[PDB]
C-alpha cells in the first residue's frame, strides 16, 4: 500500500489542451476570440501568483487577457464603476475579481455586480443559488477542479463517505454541495454521504469522521491538519490547502496534509504544489470559453 | 434514561405570542395590518390541513389572510398570472404557493415567480443563495422551526456532531446549512459538525455516523429509520417526518421509532405535535418580517 500521486498539473495541462482546441475552432468558425479581464486589488502575494498563473493559462489556450491592478485604497464605489465599465464592454467575455479584497470593500456586493453572463467565478448570488438547487450554473473553479480530479481518476462517490475540512463559501461549501447531491439532477452531484467540519470541530471529532471516509478533502489552510492515523487504508486524499511556511532556511508551499506520512496509507493523494491549484486554473479556462459561447 | 419529550405545540405558542405582540405594536404605530396570501392547487389532503393550520395561526396573531384554491387542472400560465397579480397588489405582504404542485407544473419556475420581498417560504433562488452565503434572508419555515426547537430547548450545537437524514432543497439541505455555519456571520449558524445522508447512504453507514451524533435530525419520510441502536445515549433526536401508517386503524408517525428511542435519547420530538407546529409558527415570523420590509 503506497498511494498513487495524482498530478493535478498534468491533468490541468490536458484540460487546457481541450479548451485550446475548442477556442481555436470557435475562432475559425468566425467568432470573436474570447477575452478574460481579471481585477487584482492590493498586494497579497498569493493573489499575485495565482493571477499570473490564470493569465499564463489564458495565453496557452488562446484566450486574450488583461490583469487590471488597483491599489488596496480604491473605494468600493470606484471598483463598482470599473466593473460596470467592463460589464458594458462587448469585447470582455469573462470578468473576475481576485479575492480576498480589503475590509472596506464588501465582497458579496462586488461579486453580485459582475454581470452573471460574465461570472466565470460562479460567485454571483444567482449562480450560487442555482448551484445549491442542482440547476445548470457556472460552477466555481476550485470546487469543479476537485470534482474533476475525483472523476477523471475514476474514484467512486455514490454511497461513499466523504469528509470536507473547511466551510468557506468559495471552496468548502460548494465541494460539499457537489459531492452530496443527486446524480440525476440537472447538474449531477456525487451522491456521497458528506461530513462538513470547520474551525470549531474538535480534532478528536474530525478524526472520528475521517477514519470512516473513502475521500478526505482538506480545505482548511492548516499545515499537517491531516495525518496518517486519521485516514483509513486505500482512501483518496485531496489537498486543497496552499500554506506558505519556512523551512532548512527557505520559504516554501505545503498543503494541509502530511504528504509523507499519508502517502504510505492512502490509495490516492494530491500534492502541493501541482495538485488542486493548477486544476483551479484549468476549470476557469473552461468557464471562460463557456461564457464566450453564450450557451448558459 | 427516559427522554425529555419536547413539546412543539408549547414552543410554537410562545413564538406565536411573540409575533402577536410584534404585529400589535406595528399596527398600533400606524402601519398597515400584515396580509398573507396562500395559493393552494388541487386536493392533496395534507396540503389542505397544513394550509388551514397556517391561516388559523395567522388570524390569532393579527395577520390577515386569504387562501386562493385552484383546481389541479390549472395551467402553468394561469398560475403565473395569479402570482403576478398578487406580486403587484400592495395589500399583500406575504405570498406562498403550497407544495407539492401537479406534475405538469414546474415547481422551480413557480417558486422563482413569487417576488423575493413577498417570499415568506424562502424558496426563491435569491433567498436560497443568500441563505447558503449566510446572509440575511427569509429562512424556510420548517428548517427555521428545527433550529428554534434546538435553541429554545438549550441543546448546544457549537462543536457538536449532527447528522441530518435527507437532502431535499426545502428541508434537509437548509437544516444542514443552518447547523454547520458560522455563529458570527450576518445570519448565524450552529457551528456544528454536520453529516448529510440520503437515499444512497447505506443503513450501515448511516448508523456509523448517527452513533457518533449529539443531534440526529430525520427528514427522510420513512417510518422507523432511526432506532435506539443507532443513537448515542443522551442525544437529541429531532423528527421532521410525518408518515401515515396502520395500527392494531390509520395513524401518524415520524421517522423515529418513538417508543424505542425515547428510552435511549436525552431529548426527542413527537409526531404529531413536534416540528409541524413550529413550521406554522416560523411562517408567522416571516410574514411580519415581510410586512416590515427590513430586507
Ligand atoms: N486551488 C487551490 O488548491 C486553492 C484555492 C483557494 C484557497 N486555497 C487554500 O485553501 C484554503 C481554504 O480556502 P479559503 O480561502 O476558502 O479559506 P478561509 O480563510 O475562508 O477559511 C478556511 C476554512 O478553514 C476552516 N478551519 C479552520 N480550522 C479547522 C479545523 N481544525 N478543522 C476543519 N476546518 C478548519 C474554517 O472554519 C474555514 O471554513 C486556504 O486556507 C488556502 O490555503 C486553495
Ligand atoms: N413540519 C414538518 O414536520 C414537515 C415539513 C415538510 C415535510 N415534512 C415531512 O417530511 C417528509 C419528506 O420531506 P422532504 O422535503 O424531505 O421530501 P423528499 O421526498 O423530497 O426528501 C426525502 C429525502 O429523504 C432521503 N432519503 C430517502 N431514503 C433515505 C435513507 N434510507 N436514509 C437517509 N435519507 C433518505 C432522500 O434522498 C431525500 O433527500 C414528507 O413526507 C413530510 O411528511 C414534514
Ligand atoms: N410552500 C410550502 N411551504 C411549506 O412550508 C410546506 N411544508 C408545510 O407546510 N409543512 C407543514 C405545515 C404544517 C404542518 C402541521 O400542522 N403539522 C401538524 C399536523 C399534522 C397533521 N397531519 N394531518 N393533519 N394534521 C403536526 O405535525 O403536529 N406540518 C407540516 C409546503 N408543503 N409547501
Ligand atoms: N475571484 C477568485 N477566484 C478564485 O478562483 C480564487 N482562488 C484562486 O485563484 N485559487 C488558486 C489559483 C491558482 C493557484 C495556483 O496556480 N497554484 C499553484 C501554486 C502557485 C503558487 N506559486 N507560489 N505560490 N503559489 C499550485 O498549487 O501548484 N492556486 C489557487 C480567488 N482567491 N479569487
Author numbering:
A (entry chain A): 35 to 281, 284 to 332
B (entry chain B): 35 to 282, 286 to 332
What are the paper's exact sentences on this?
The tool compound TH7299, as well as two of the most promising candidates, TH9028 and TH9619, were chosen to investigate the MTHFD2 mechanism of action and cancer biology. Furthermore, we determined the cocrystal structures of TH7299, TH9028 and TH9619 in complexes with human MTHFD2 to assess their binding mode and identify critical interactions in the binding pocket. At a predetermined temperature of 57 °C, isothermal dose–response fingerprint (CETSAITDRF) analysis of TH7299, TH9028 and TH9619 in HL-60 cells accurately reflected their relative potencies in biochemical and viability assays, as well as demonstrating the difference in target stabilization potential for TH9619 in nontumorigenic lymphoblastoid cell line (LCL)-889 cells compared with HL-60 AML cells. In contrast, TH9028 and TH9619 showed overall strong antiproliferative efficacy in AML cells and T-ALL Jurkat cells comparable to standard-of-care compounds, with reduced effect on LCL viability. Treatment with TH7299 resulted in approximately 50% reduction of RF speed and significantly shorter DNA fibers; meanwhile supplementation with thymidine was sufficient to fully rescue replication speeds. Similar fork speed reductions were also observed on TH9028 treatment in HL-60 and THP-1 cells. Although MTX and VE-821 significantly blocked DNA RF progression in both cancer and nontumorigenic cells, MTHFD2 inhibitors effectively impaired DNA replication only in AML cells, sparing nontumorigenic lymphocytes. The same cancer selectivity was observed for TH9028.
